[PDB]
Amino acid sequence: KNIDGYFKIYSKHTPIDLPQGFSALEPLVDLPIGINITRFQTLL
Amino acid sequence: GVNCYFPLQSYGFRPTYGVGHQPYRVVVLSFELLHAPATVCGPKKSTNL
């Protein structure tokens, strides 16, 4: 997410398509960079 | 050669030289502020609980 000039990353690693179990993502990182993001990719 | 020169030239620093010709290291600190959130803040000392 990137809303108020900060870039936030939440995450969770859960053991095992997608199961019906419920799990909330905990906040990991809240960066202070203030760039504009509108596109993204993945890195292999 | 004539009309041909190597642009860099040395300072020839040597101890028996006066104050004018002596190495003076310079550190130009600058402060950059952009629209991104600030990340380099200042110790912010506190009070006992």
From Swiss-Prot, chain A:
Protein name: Spike protein S1
Glycosylated residues (UniProt): 36
Function as written in the Swiss-Prot or TrEMBL entry: Attaches the virion to the cell membrane by interacting with host receptor, initiating the infection. The major receptor is host ACE2. When S2/S2' has been cleaved, binding to the receptor triggers direct fusion at the cell membrane. When S2/S2' has not been cleaved, binding to the receptor results in internalization of the virus by endocytosis using host TFRC and GRM2 and leading to fusion of the virion membrane with the host endosomal membrane. Alternatively, may use NRP1/NRP2 and integrin as entry receptors.
Subunit structure: Binds to host ACE2. RBD also interacts with the N-linked glycan on 'Asn-90' of ACE2. Cleavage of S generates a polybasic C-terminal sequence on S1 that binds to host Neuropilin-1 (NRP1) and Neuropilin-2 (NRP2) receptors. Interacts with host integrin alpha-5/beta-1 (ITGA5:ITGB1) and with ACE2 in complex with integrin alpha-5/beta-1 (ITGA5:ITGB1). May interact via cytoplasmic c-terminus with M protein. May interact (via N-terminus) with host bilirubin and biliverdin, thereby preventing antibody binding to the SARS-CoV-2 spike NTD via an allosteric mechanism.
Portion of the full sequence shown: 195 to 242 of 1273
Gene name of the encoded protein: S
